[PDB]
Amino acid sequence: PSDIEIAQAAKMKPVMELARGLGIQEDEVELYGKYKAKISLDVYRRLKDKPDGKLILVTAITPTPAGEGKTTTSVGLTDALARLGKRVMVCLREPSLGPSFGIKGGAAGGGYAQVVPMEDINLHFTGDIHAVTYAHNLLAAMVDNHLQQGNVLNIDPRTITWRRVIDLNDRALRNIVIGLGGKANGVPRETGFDISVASEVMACLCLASDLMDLKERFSRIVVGYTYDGKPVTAGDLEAQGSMALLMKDAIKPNLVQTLENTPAFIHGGPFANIAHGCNSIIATKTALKLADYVVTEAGFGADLGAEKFYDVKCRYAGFKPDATVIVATVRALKMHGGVPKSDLATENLEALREGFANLEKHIENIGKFGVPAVVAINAFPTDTEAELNLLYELCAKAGAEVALSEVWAKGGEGGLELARKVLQTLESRPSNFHVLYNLDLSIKDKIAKIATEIYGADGVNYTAEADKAIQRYESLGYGNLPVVMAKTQYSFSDDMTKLGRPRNFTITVREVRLSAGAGFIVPITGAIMTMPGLPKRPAACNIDIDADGVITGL
Amino acid sequence: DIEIAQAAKMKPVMELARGLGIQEDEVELYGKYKAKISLDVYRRLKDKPDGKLILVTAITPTPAGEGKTTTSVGLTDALARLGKRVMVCLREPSLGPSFGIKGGAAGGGYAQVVPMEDINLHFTGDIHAVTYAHNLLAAMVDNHLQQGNVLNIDPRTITWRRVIDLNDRALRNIVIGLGGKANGVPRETGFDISVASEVMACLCLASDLMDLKERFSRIVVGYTYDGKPVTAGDLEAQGSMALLMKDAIKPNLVQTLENTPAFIHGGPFANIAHGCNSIIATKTALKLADYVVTEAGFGADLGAEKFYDVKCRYAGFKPDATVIVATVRALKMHGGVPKSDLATENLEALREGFANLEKHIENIGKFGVPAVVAINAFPTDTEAELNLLYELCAKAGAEVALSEVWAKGGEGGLELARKVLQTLESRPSNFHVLYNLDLSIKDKIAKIATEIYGADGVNYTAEADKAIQRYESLGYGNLPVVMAKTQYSFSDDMTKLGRPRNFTITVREVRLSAGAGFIVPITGAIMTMPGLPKRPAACNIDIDADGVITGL
Numbered sequence A: 001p002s003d004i005e006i007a008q009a010a011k012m013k014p015v016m017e018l019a020r021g022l023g024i025q026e027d028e029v030e031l032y033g034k035y036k037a038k039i040s041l042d043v044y045r046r047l048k049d050k051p052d053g054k055l056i057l058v059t060a061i062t063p064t065p066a067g068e069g070k071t072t073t074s075v076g077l078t079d080a081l082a083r084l085g086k087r088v089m090v091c092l093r094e095p096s097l098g099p100s101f102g103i104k105g106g107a108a109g110g111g112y113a114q115v116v117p118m119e120d121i122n123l124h125f126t127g128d129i130h131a132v133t134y135a136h137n138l139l140a141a142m143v144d145n146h147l148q149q150g151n152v153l154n155i156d157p158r159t160i161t162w163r164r165v166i167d168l169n170d171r172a173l174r175n176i177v178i179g180l181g182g183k184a185n186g187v188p189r190e191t192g193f194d195i196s197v198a199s200e201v202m203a204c205l206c207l208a209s210d211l212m213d214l215k216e217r218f219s220r221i222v223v224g225y226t227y228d229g230k231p232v233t234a235g236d237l238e239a240q241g242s243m244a245l246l247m248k249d250a251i252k253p254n255l256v257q258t259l260e261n262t263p264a265f266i267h268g269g270p271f272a273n274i275a276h277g278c279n280s281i282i283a284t285k286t287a288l289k290l291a292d293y294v295v296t297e298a299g300f301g302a303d304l305g306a307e308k309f310y311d312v313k314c315r316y317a318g319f320k321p322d323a324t325v326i327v328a329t330v331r332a333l334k335m336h337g338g339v340p341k342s343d344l345a346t347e348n349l350e351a352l353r354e355g356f357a358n359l360e361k362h363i364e365n366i367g368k369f370g371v372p373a374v375v376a377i378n379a380f381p382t383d384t385e386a387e388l389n390l391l392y393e394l395c396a397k398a399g400a401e402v403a404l405s406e407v408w409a410k411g412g413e414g415g416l417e418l419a420r421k422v423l424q425t426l427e428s429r430p431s432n433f434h435v436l437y438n439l440d441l442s443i444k445d446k447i448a449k450i451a452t453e454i455y456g457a458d459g460v461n462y463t464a465e466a467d468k469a470i471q472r473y474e475s476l477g478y479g480n481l482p483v484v485m486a487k488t489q490y491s492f493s494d495d496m497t498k499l500g501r502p503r504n505f506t507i508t509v510r511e512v513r514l515s516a517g518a519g520f521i522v523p524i525t526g527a528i529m530t531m532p533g534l535p536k537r538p539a540a541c542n543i544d545i546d547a548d549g550v551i552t553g554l
Numbered sequence B: 001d002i003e004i005a006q007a008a009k010m011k012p013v014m015e016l017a018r019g020l021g022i023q024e025d026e027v028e029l030y031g032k033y034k035a036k037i038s039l040d041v042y043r044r045l046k047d048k049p050d051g052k053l054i055l056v057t058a059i060t061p062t063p064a065g066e067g068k069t070t071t072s073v074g075l076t077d078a079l080a081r082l083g084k085r086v087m088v089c090l091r092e093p094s095l096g097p098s099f100g101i102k103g104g105a106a107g108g109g110y111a112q113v114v115p116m117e118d119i120n121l122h123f124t125g126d127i128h129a130v131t132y133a134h135n136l137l138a139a140m141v142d143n144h145l146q147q148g149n150v151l152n153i154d155p156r157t158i159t160w161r162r163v164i165d166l167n168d169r170a171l172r173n174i175v176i177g178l179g180g181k182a183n184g185v186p187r188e189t190g191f192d193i194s195v196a197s198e199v200m201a202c203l204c205l206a207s208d209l210m211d212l213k214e215r216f217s218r219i220v221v222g223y224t225y226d227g228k229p230v231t232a233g234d235l236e237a238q239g240s241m242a243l244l245m246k247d248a249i250k251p252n253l254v255q256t257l258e259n260t261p262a263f264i265h266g267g268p269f270a271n272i273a274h275g276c277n278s279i280i281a282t283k284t285a286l287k288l289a290d291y292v293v294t295e296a297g298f299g300a301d302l303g304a305e306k307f308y309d310v311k312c313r314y315a316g317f318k319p320d321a322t323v324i325v326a327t328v329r330a331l332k333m334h335g336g337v338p339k340s341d342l343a344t345e346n347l348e349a350l351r352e353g354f355a356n357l358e359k360h361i362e363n364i365g366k367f368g369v370p371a372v373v374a375i376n377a378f379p380t381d382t383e384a385e386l387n388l389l390y391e392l393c394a395k396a397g398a399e400v401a402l403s404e405v406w407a408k409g410g411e412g413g414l415e416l417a418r419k420v421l422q423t424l425e426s427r428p429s430n431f432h433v434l435y436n437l438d439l440s441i442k443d444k445i446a447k448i449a450t451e452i453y454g455a456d457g458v459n460y461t462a463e464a465d466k467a468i469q470r471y472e473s474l475g476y477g478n479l480p481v482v483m484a485k486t487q488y489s490f491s492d493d494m495t496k497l498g499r500p501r502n503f504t505i506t507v508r509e510v511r512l513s514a515g516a517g518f519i520v521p522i523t524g525a526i527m528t529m530p531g532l533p534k535r536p537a538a539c540n541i542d543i544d545a546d547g548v549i550t551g552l
């Protein structure tokens, strides 16, 4: 039964009620209708010295374009725990608007494991991405006005790294020339747009602890350089105050719920292939005051999202994840064993056997961070009973804790086996969380650490552009920043072609960006683009709404 | 006395809503002090009586503005202070100008709508809905070119621009689709400011979500190589566009500082677009109130004519009175006093500049709705100067009232409120439009230019000629006209002050808004994306652990 059919038929508690059931007081809630709200940052502030609940991360194997089921699983696990009577919350990322009209669709879950109101969540929600987009683009506009008004600071406009942003898959704005028409109309220069969720401004939102912090980070954002190579910042242009203003509400996290009325925060939405892939620190640390157990997702596979959750988010938050759930699927493991994407509804026992190496490696990789894993087998409607025991069997045989999850088709009661297993590991195998690398290393050493330890490459190559940039950033004193790698989600390699556990290969960084405001560095690898495109048949064509109800949203 | 420093005073909008006879389950809250009202309110009240409709317009402005909004709000509070059941309908301010020059559009002093900062920034996200529907269409157009261009669109004739609600001059003329075969198809475009979007115009003229969707579908984005038009319908975008507008379509309820209810819905500018708030908000408010005050942008040559010939025409409104805001400082400017000298007294310059207001007074008379001048008093106004004007007005002889609504709130608008009631009770209106749709495009341009602006005639650049021919050829000859033209003069020349004579308008570009249902001749040098000044107000804007430091 279609995801929007059942999302629209849902039966929701007023969120003011859920809020109150969490120790949040009426005047700390700001409603966006009965079913959505924003929680004050005073909640976390007044509880600063109270103990945390347990932190549970969900990550996954290397996906197909439709995705496996982190979100779908995160929601379900949360519903299952609520059904064992636990005081639990999910933290998730706000879905990017753009992909609802292209390809992979929304990010509110699936079947009976969803967050709702789904169509709000997937579209405009509470206006957060819009606030990111306007602060980002206001800065750009100010940069461009500056050039026009005599270029007082002597910016070399051919070095401006600050791009524009919009929350759509618009490939035609990747590379553009701007400022044309003559002397009344700006200064010609080459730029383009990224998708808003990849904005550094969203990164700042996701790492900041409150408005004034966000304002200070904004002011350290570097937009470009003078003709003599001195950096020029958003604070040099006095933009941070306006930028902060535009984020005045977006800083607060959003409360919705699951289909079974369990509470859920949704806040910040960076992708994990081209950004840091986590929800806001603010959401997650607030939730940890409010619930005994907090489930949260990192984007794409564990080589990307899980790695950056540990090495960036946890680092900057002081978080100590207690357990980690790895989502695996028969569909995907078969793909990693040879089966084409068009033949996956077919049984193939060997292609799951030789596809397993993929998961083998993700488990290995999680183990390196010292937090105990449980595998979740997200049973797809087509997966045969035989394929399903083999995977169970392979996970046990590898030593790993496992559980089948029928959360998609059955909701929270599809996730009891799994929920017990997570509870089992919280109670019986404590976590020993530590980062992969220290901050005092070179940029190139940190990159090589991730390259070799996680993706399993032999080493890393640099274009001259990249080398020039790394020099620049260490010499300017940003050498201590952590690394958010941009790379394809479809492989451990930077070649989207290398399925499974590719061996004897090299990653090539072509471009290096600096996020001095969010406080990390972004080495861009392979051919990954920072603005995605629409397909031949965009979801949009099938999308509609009548005197009430909507179709084509997924 | 700072605008933003009146961040004090309000009551829950839900109380305000029930007090207009709106049901609880028709109110959607965005905090305790903003809401969206269902379209079911108007529907169920369809057969009930309309209140009195009052338009507030103005003389030709100083860049700072002459106080329409400030006056519309004041008037509303003043009527309430006379025990009247009254509402204001306003436009949502464009976000861009709060960081630019002119600021937000929530009023002034003690005549403002609140919560101001929300109202002027993201508000309830309508402008963002507009922006994304428009730009998703743009994105689908470009994707289509990229995926074999099956419809054979000549990318060099695409009229559909992109949009963003900032003053960004550098996005006026751009080249996109660069980088090779994987990254699109190169083409010249740019951006307009979001409030000037056709999508906004449609929102502002439509009656519900399914009307809006069908309008979207009729939007022409460009042409095939053999000149066949291609629509948003042909690309199947209207459903998604409408989805993104599902809440934007419902109007918003806020209030005034003295707690009078207010609708804010739709933002289009009057120089570049059609300059009125939504029909939805206006027609709804007529059911809930005995008196509905509403503003049209810039001077009467722009917003008034458009409110009358476009909004009123499509809505079936008959306006009952019209208020013309005038100021001493502006009249002086028009009498030759430089911008920098408008604080200093100068009676003779005020006598000379009167001509401007005189023509606006005449022009309102041609639509057949009676008029009341509001003289909106600034702190620099001499007692002598305010008397000269009042005398000038009654000798004209229009009804006049001094207004101290800015400094005093509704108490300051009693004499004005009285005169307006006095006009509605004795001098009923005989509204009629300036022109008929049967005319040709060029004839309608020429009525408006001749009768309202005072031009001797109109010239067309070759490009404008082509376009007008193309639209007549295609069946759109019968559309009404929404002139784009500078607010600073009756002419298309921003330096021709007072009441210029013996001038000609030149239209250099003509757009077709097939979905909103009008045509836009662009005159003189006016741009559809504005720019940021030397020192933008953004540079002085800030927020601490609570308090905001600029709204202007």
Ligand SMILES: Nc1ncnc2c1ncn2[C@@H]1O[C@H](COP(=O)(O)OP(=O)(O)O)[C@@H](O)[C@H]1O
Residues within 6 Å of the ligand: A003, A060, A066, A067, A068, A069, A070, A071, A072, A073, A105, A106, A107, A108, A109, A110, A111, A300, A378, A379, A380, A381, A408, A409, A554
């Ligand atoms: N077990 C399942 N069977 C069928 N569809 C599923 C299942 N789990 C998830 N989905 C659907 O597949 C897509 C991917 O799920 P999602 O939770 O979004 O994965 P991820 O979070 O890793 O991107 C969504 O459309 C979801 O509704």
Ligand SMILES: Nc1ncnc2c1ncn2[C@@H]1O[C@H](COP(=O)(O)OP(=O)(O)O)[C@@H](O)[C@H]1O
Residues within 6 Å of the ligand: B003, B058, B064, B065, B066, B067, B068, B069, B070, B071, B103, B105, B107, B108, B109, B298, B376, B377, B378, B379, B406, B407, B552
């Ligand atoms: N009587 C007055 N004294 C001082 N400032 C005023 C007065 N009336 C309006 N203003 C201010 O001047 C600017 C323009 O007023 P506004 O109501 O926006 O006119 P318009 O709607 O025609 O632009 C605003 O900053 C407003 O607060």
Ligand SMILES: [Mg+2]
Residues within 6 Å of the ligand: A070, A071, A072, A107, A297
């Ligand atoms: Mg997901």
Ligand SMILES: [Mg+2]
Residues within 6 Å of the ligand: B068, B069, B070, B105, B295
């Ligand atoms: Mg105004």
